[PDB]
Amino acid sequence: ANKVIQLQKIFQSSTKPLWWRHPRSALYLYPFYAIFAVAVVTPLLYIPNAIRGIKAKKA
Amino acid sequence: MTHLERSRHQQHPFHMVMPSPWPIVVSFALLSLALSTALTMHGYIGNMNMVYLALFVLLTSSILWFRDIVAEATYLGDHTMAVRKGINLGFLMFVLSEVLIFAGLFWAYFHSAMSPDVTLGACWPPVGIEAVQPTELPLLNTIILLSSGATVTYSHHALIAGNRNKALSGLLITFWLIVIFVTCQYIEYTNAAFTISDGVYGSVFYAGTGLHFLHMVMLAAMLGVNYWRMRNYHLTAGHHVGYETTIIYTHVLDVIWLFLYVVFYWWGV
Amino acid sequence: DEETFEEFTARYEKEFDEAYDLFEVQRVLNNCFSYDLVPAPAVIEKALRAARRVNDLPTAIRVFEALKYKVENEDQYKAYLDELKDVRQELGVPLKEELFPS
Amino acid sequence: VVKTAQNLAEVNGPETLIGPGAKEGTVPTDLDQETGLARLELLGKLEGIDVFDTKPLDSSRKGTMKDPIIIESYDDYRYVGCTGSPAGSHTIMWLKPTVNEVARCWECGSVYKLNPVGVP
Amino acid sequence: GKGDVAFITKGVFLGLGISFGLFGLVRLLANPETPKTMNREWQLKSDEYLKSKNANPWGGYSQVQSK
Amino acid sequence: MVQRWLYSTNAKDIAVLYFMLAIFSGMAGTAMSLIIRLELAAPGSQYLHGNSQLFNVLVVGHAVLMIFFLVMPALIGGFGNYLLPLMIGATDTAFPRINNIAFWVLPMGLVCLVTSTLVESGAGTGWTVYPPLSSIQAHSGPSVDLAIFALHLTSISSLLGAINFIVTTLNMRTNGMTMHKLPLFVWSIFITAFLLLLSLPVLSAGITMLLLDRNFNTSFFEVSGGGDPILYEHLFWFFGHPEVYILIIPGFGIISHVVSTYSKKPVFGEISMVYAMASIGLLGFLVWSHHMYIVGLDADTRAYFTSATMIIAIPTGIKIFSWLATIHGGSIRLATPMLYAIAFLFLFTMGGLTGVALANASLDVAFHDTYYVVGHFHYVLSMGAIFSLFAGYYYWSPQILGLNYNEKLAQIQFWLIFIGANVIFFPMHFLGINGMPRRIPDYPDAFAGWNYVASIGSFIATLSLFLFIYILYDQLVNGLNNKVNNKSVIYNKAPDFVESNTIFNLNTVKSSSIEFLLTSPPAVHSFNTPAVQS
Amino acid sequence: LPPNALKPAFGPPDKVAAQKFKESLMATEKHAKDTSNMWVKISVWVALPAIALTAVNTYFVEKEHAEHREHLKHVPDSEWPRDYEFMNIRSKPFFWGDGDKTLFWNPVVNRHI
Amino acid sequence: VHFKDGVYENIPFKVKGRKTPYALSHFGFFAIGFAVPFVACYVQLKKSGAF
Ligand code: HEA
Ligand code: HEA
Ligand SMILES: [Ca+2]
Ligand SMILES: [Cu+2]
Ligand SMILES: [Zn+2]
């Protein structure tokens, strides 16, 4: 609803990093770090079974 | 302006970007995607939850990168004329790279079709394969693409002409026509006789038009974000470069769909 | 350059006459010995007088070291030393071989 | 408390380059919703004043130590590439006058003095 | 300057000697048993066959390279 | 510390991350080549207990690491991202987050290549991963998939960096620099980026086709199903010859800088060098089937391809004759980059002459998949591109690091690698002309004689690499003292013959590019005000 | 306090390349209005009398192909034509689902026996 | 961000003021790279029963 001047006055007069300057940034950024932290380390846990040759249980 | 006050600005028109986490985040997401798909393709991981999580993380990290680009371009005023020219040139080199991917796929189709094998029967399309006829639904798919370009052209020129309702409505018509095309391609893929496993014909056909399908679903996404930014007054009458890149993208997907049409549906039947 | 030899000498005579300090006379001497010709005796004489005007003595020795490196023979060098002898003894510069005898 | 700097002489830092919004039913033109360096460049082009100097080097004459070729700089140094008293007459000699040293070319021998117009 | 050509000659010959010596010391870690064909008797008995089959007439056919 | 190096957005930091990864992966590839060459030293199983699959996996790792993880991120990734903004006067590259992701997708390609080695048996297929060997029948398991993903992430990096380079030198040149007044290294990175942009798509298409063939039951190159592996050979080598010209063109730029600054005279006919590089890049797309002379083409196909492969000897000959002309009449200052450049000018021409021996399809039936081809390309790779890479390091390292190297140790290192590389790669022509095939872990006993001397030379080459590691250590620790004592060359140009030692002191550097005028180690904000040029 | 901080950094403001900038600024508006007018004219005179003629063509084929699938639903798999050698390549089973079914596997038009 | 200038501030690793010797970091950076194919060789020979 044309908040662009009001958002310019926040994004320019701010100290926080650019991905944190919006008021709603804590709603995006805090779940994403948890989802990212499991998404990058769960294949690394399956790397040793793939080296040993152990397939997962499907039946 | 005085020397004292000119010294409080940049002296050169180029964007010195602040340090950002999304390069290394997208890199680790591509790592997790590669390591997840290479282990679910061979059964070392039970289900597709890791691949789903990796693709979701990849998409959301790209979205946060694009959010920061929107923030730089709109709320900090960092995109000058030279930066605009550079972004347009980078998008043109990008679409040249993708046209070359399609040229490799057309090379694959032509190498299979110019003189076919003996295991298909010196025949094209091969024996038993019920080819998609070019008259029924792909003709409507060419029509709703040549018309989608005509809609986005007046939407663009009405964005320049000061009109707001005539540009938003044209963008909305363009977006809905693109998703009409995507659902018609889904209907063709369901009601198609051959599958992707049905030999080299199904391979090259679904490779070419499925890459076009993926480019069209990303086109629908960027038409949606252009509608959002035009309704919320981000796009202006003289400075709309993401919109311009989307227009270039529509008009190259149009001509490569035409080449896919006349090659995969007319010459190859 | 489609330059004749005479245009070279008339260019570098007036080029040496307009050098005004030690940077300029050494620079002009460098880019006149950086050609595929030994300079004529007249422009070497103008170079000696130019190094006299700036009051630097080892450049007027390095002129003769440069044309020793630049000529093809040692008799061309001795021909330069014959009729450049008067200006050399008038300015009073020594050649490097008689200054540092081996 | 601040306002919007109609022309270039009213620019006072970056809090003056904000803009008024569009109304509600109009597409914004860029005098409404541009900020920052893009608004500075837009203001300059509206006045005709090209900010961001892109003029090439003065190669009309040969700088002496009596009259150098004065190079304006917003810091204490500037890299300058000499190629001759016409446009290109030798292989480019890249130089760097500071505030305390002129630069002499050594191929053509032109001399570049620097004047610092900026603030330290 | 003043005897560094000699330094970077001695260093090259020292590097060659060190490389030869370490190559020998890690050839001492290889398989203890070379193949049976790499002795003189086997290679004479292969040149027997090659002379019987007229092999490599204008060049040479002889296979002996070991002791 | 995390924002400067993890969240990085300046090109001069991403360049040194590229360089660290490049020299790490070059140590990896050199270790792999040492294992290959140690197994090849004598007939029979020597060090790997039989197990020719492990040999093939090591050959794959050696080729992929040395090409896509040493030479490309060294030359393009390090030197282009560092020097092209500094030599066009740009403050940074255009698109810097792209420039950061184009580095950070390379450790991820490295870890997926290493676990490609560690899963079931590794992908022993050659670096040209040909089906049907690279298929799912002949290579069961996730090895080849992970190798294909390594190639995907490296192609993502080298495509994003290519877009970045093209735009940043078409758009961010400083305010006197027309396109004709560019340095030759910038033209090198420019033409290389176009070759990357035009060639990496077809490779990505071909190996994605292979990946879908392996895992998604589709049949692009499956014969029982309608495929053809010659389609893979075409789609691969349409990238594969532009790839090897990509590997060499920044080397041409580095040599044209080094030769001119150590001959103290400019390059003979610079714009003809630009035209020659552009002609090599254009003609490199027209020659791709000289790797396919045996597969069964027509005679007119092979006649055209001998003609087109032959007529690229003209611009490379123009470049090499121009290098000889720009050292003729000079004042040669025999420093380590000059030694590397002269060694380039000899050994690259020997590799190119064996290349024009290979260009004749009439004759390539005698040399295809032999060690003669291995001799040709290891000449023009490990003596063209590696020698120009060493020349670029010894040419730019004290400027962009602030620390000088030991000069005597550098010349010892040069002479050791110049001896050792010749001793490896010169007998390979003898082996290949006598009929020794490629990619074999064991050979007939008649090939033992030159194989032994080649693996003796391998130890000389890796000894000079270890010496180079020590040279890096001595530069990083004692690099401030090497300026004080006489262990290093401080000025790469001596005074001219009439230039005083005091008149030299006001004009210490005489360069035709901005790189040697900057502050040593250059500032985080170089070019606050823009540089200016007539 | 520098002495030269308060002098102007640009000098004379140019008056014809500002006017030419502003006339192009206000002339691409008028040409964009006329361009939008003729393009909505094209998009409603040509593009919707194209969808209007192809929707009535595709409703007929959406009838007569759905009815062909309707009568094909009554033909069991021993009355199915035997697949050629290249049809339904099975190198390894697909990693999702039940094996042989692909991503858009409509079981009416596709059958693997 | 404004970053530090100087001689040792352009490298991601620490050289001068360290509680450990630098040659540790330097030569263990390269010995790991020289030792990846030996780890590769060891695991693909233990998988093939040669050890
Ligand atoms: C980048 C290209 C490159 C380089 C440098 C090398 C270097 C070497 N290579 Fe090879 N090689 C290939 C590319 C290269 N190779 C390719 C493409 C194949 C084909 C694979 C296939 O057939 O599928 C191959 C295959 C191949 C074969 C054929 C074997 C076969 O067919 O199976 C052999 C033979 O022994 C070999 C050995 C060597 C040896 C002993 C070196 C030695 O020269 C190593 C000595 C080199 C150095 C010591 C370089 C310095 C090291 C650095 C890290 C530079 C650092 C400097 C800076 C960072 C500034 N490699
Ligand atoms: C550094 C990268 C590089 C460069 C620059 C070259 C340069 C050339 N190469 Fe090479 N080549 C490779 C990398 C490179 N190559 C690789 C990696 C392979 C093997 C791939 C694989 O199988 O795995 C290969 C293999 C290869 C083949 C395939 C053979 C086979 O696989 O069976 C051919 C065929 O024509 C070829 C020819 C040439 C020619 C004609 C040049 C020319 O560009 C050389 C031009 C230079 C000169 C000609 C010398 C200088 C000129 C003069 C002194 C002028 C006077 C000379 C004449 C008039 C002749 N090389
Ligand atoms: Ca062996
Ligand atoms: Cu080639
Ligand atoms: Zn000059």
Q: What class has domain B79-269? A: mainly alpha
Contacts of F191 (CB under 8 A, 6+ apart): F249, F277, F278, F281
Residue G95: CA atoms inside 13 Å, Cβ hemisphere, count? 20
C67, C88 Cβ separation under 8 angstroms: no
Alpha-carbon gap, residue C49 to C70, rounded angstroms: 20
CA F491 to chain centre: 28
Mutate to test the pocket of ligand 2, among F380, F383, F433 (most ligand atoms within 8 A of CB): F380
C-alpha torsion angle, residues B184, B186, B190, B191 (rounded to 10): 20
Q: What's the residue count for chain H?
A: 51
Q: Tokens at residue B105, please? A: 């796929």
Experimental method: cryo-EM
Q: Do A54 and B44 touch (CB under 8 A)?
A: yes
CA angle F87, F92, F93 (to 5 degrees): 90
Give the separation between CA F65 and CA F63, rounded to whole angstroms: 6
Q: d(Cα B45, Cα B230) in Å, to the nearest integer? A: 44
Which helix (H) or strand (E) covers residue F461, if one does? helix F448-478
Pairing verdict, β D111-112 and D103-104: antiparallel
Give the separation between CA B251 and CA B216, rounded to whole angstroms: 12
Cβ contact B236:D32 at 8 Å:
yes
Count other Cβ atoms within 10 Å, centred on residue G48: 11
Q: Which domains does chain H have, with CATH numbers?
A: 1-51 (4.10.49.10)
Tell me if B2 and G7 make a contact (CB, 8 A cut-off): yes
Q: Nearest CB to B167: which of D8, D22, D27? A: D27
**Whole-angstrom distance, CA of residue F26 vs CA of residue H38:** 15
And the tokens for E62? 């002889």
D82 neighbors D105 (Cβ within 8 angstroms): yes
The bridge status of strand D111-112 relative to strand D114-116 is unpaired
Cα–Cα distance for residue pair D8/B116, rounded to 1 Å: 70
Instruction: Retrieve residue B14's tokens.
Output: 């180029």
Name the maximum alpha-carbon separation found in chain E: 65
- Which residues in C lie closer than 8 A to residue F497 (C-beta atoms)? 30, 33, 62, 65-66, 69
The rounded distance, in Å, linking the Cα atoms of B61 and B21 is 10
- Rounded CA separation B93/B103 (Å): 15
Provide the CB-side half-sphere exposure for G78 (13 A, CA).
0
C1-102: what CATH class? mainly alpha
- Judge residue C83's burial from the number of C-beta atoms within 10 Å of its C-beta, 0-12 exposed, 13-18 middle, 19 or more buried: exposed
Which residues have CB under 6 Å of ligand 2?
Answer: F 128, 244, 247-248, 290-291, 309, 312-313, 316-317, 320, 349, 352-353, 355-356, 358-359, 364, 368, 373, 376-377, 380-381, 384-385
Q: Which of F93, F116, F125, F157 is catalytic?
A: F157
| Closest residue in chain H to residue F520, using alpha carbons only | H7
Q: Which of F357, F377, F378, F381 is nearest to F367 (CA)?
A: F357
- Whether the Cβ atoms of residue F192 and residue F250 lie closer than 8 Å to each other: yes
Structural domain boundaries of chain B?
Answer: 1-78, 79-269
* CB contact at 8 A, D40 and D51: yes
Residue type, F181: K
Question: Does any ligand 1 atom lie closer than 6 A to the CB of residue F143?
Answer: no
Nearest partner of B34 among G91, G102, F111, judged by Cα: F111
Answer positive or negative: Cα dihedral of A24, A30, A35, A37: positive
- For residues B64 and F372, what is the distance between their CA atoms, to the nearest angstrom? 52
Cα–Cα distance list, C22 to D94, D104, F501, F502 (Å): 21, 12, 12, 10
HSE at residue B48, side-chain half, CA atoms within 13 A, is: 8
Residue F134 in domain: yes
Atom of ligand 2 nearest to the CA of F128: 23
Identity of the residue in G85, G91, G102 whose CB atom sits nearest the CB atom of F137: G91
**Cis amide leading into F495 (omega within 30):** no
Mutation for E interface: F45, F49, F447, F460, most E CBs within 10 A: F460
Do D8 and D61 lie in one domain? The reply is no
Instruction: Locate the ligand 1 atom nearest the alpha carbon of residue F22 and give its number.
Output: 58
Q: Is D107 on the interface with B (CB under 8 A)?
A: no
Q: Quick one: CA torsion of C78, C83, C84, C86, rounded to 10 degrees?
A: 130
Cis previous bond, B125, omega within 30: yes
Contact by Cβ (8 Å): F113, H36: no
The structure tokens listed for F165 are 């380079």
- Kindly state the DSSP code that residue F179 receives in the 8-state scheme: G
Between the alpha carbon of residue F131 and those of residues F61, F135, F292, F434, the distances in Å are 18, 5, 15, 28
CB F71 within 8 A of CB F30: no
Say whether F291 is catalytic. Answer: yes
DSSP state, D77? B
Nearest to A28 by CA among G96, B71, F175: B71
In terms of Cα–Cα distance, which of F529, F530, F527, F534 is closest to F10?
F527
Ligand nearest to the CA of F44: 3
Question: Of F217, F218, F220, F221, which to mutate for an interface test with G (greatest number of G Cβ within 10 Å)?
Answer: F217
Q: D80-82 and F532-533 as β-strands: parallel, antiparallel, unpaired? A: parallel
Return the SS3 of F322: helix
CA of F312 to the centre of ligand 4 (A): 11
Please say whether the beta carbons of B174 and B250 come within 8 A: yes
Q: Which domain holds residue D101?
A: 55-120
Distance in Å, CA F309 to ligand 4 centroid: 8
For tokens 């991917």, name the residue. B101
Place of tokens 């500002």: G18
- DSSP E strands, F126-251: none
Same domain, D117 and D98: yes
Residue numbers in G near B200 (CB within 8 A): 86
CA proximity to F95, closest of F169, F21, F155, F151 = F169
How far is residue C94's CA from residue B197's CA, in Å, rounded to a whole number? 94
F120: annotated active-site residue: no
Q: How many domains does chain F have?
A: 1
Whether F415 contacts chain E with CB within 8 A: yes
**Per-residue H/E/C for B12-81:** CCCCCCCCCCHHHHHHHHHHHHHHHHHHHCCCCCCCCHHHHHHHHHHHHHHHHHHHHHHHHHHCCCCCCH
Q: How far apart are CA F57 and CA F143, in angstroms?
A: 10
Q: What is the CA radius of gyration of chain B?
A: 22
Count of all residues that appear for chain G in the document: 113
CATH topology of domain B1-78: Helix Hairpins (1.10.287)
What is d(CA F466, CA F458) in angstroms, rounded to the nearest whole number? 12
Helix axes F336-358, F229-263, angle to 10 degrees: 150
Looking at H1-51, list the stretches that DSSP marks H as alpha helix, in order from N- to C-terminal side: 22-46
**Token pair 């890299």 in the structure block, residue:** D79
CA of B62 to the centre of ligand 3 (A): 50
User: Hey, is E44 helix, strand or coil?
Assistant: helix
**Cα(F418)–Cα(F343) distance, rounded to whole angstroms?**
8
Q: Which atom of ligand 1 is nearest to the CA of F440?
A: 32
CA B247 to centroid of chain Cα atoms: 11
CB pairs under 8 A between F and G: 27
Q: Which ligand is nearest to the CA of F250?
A: 2
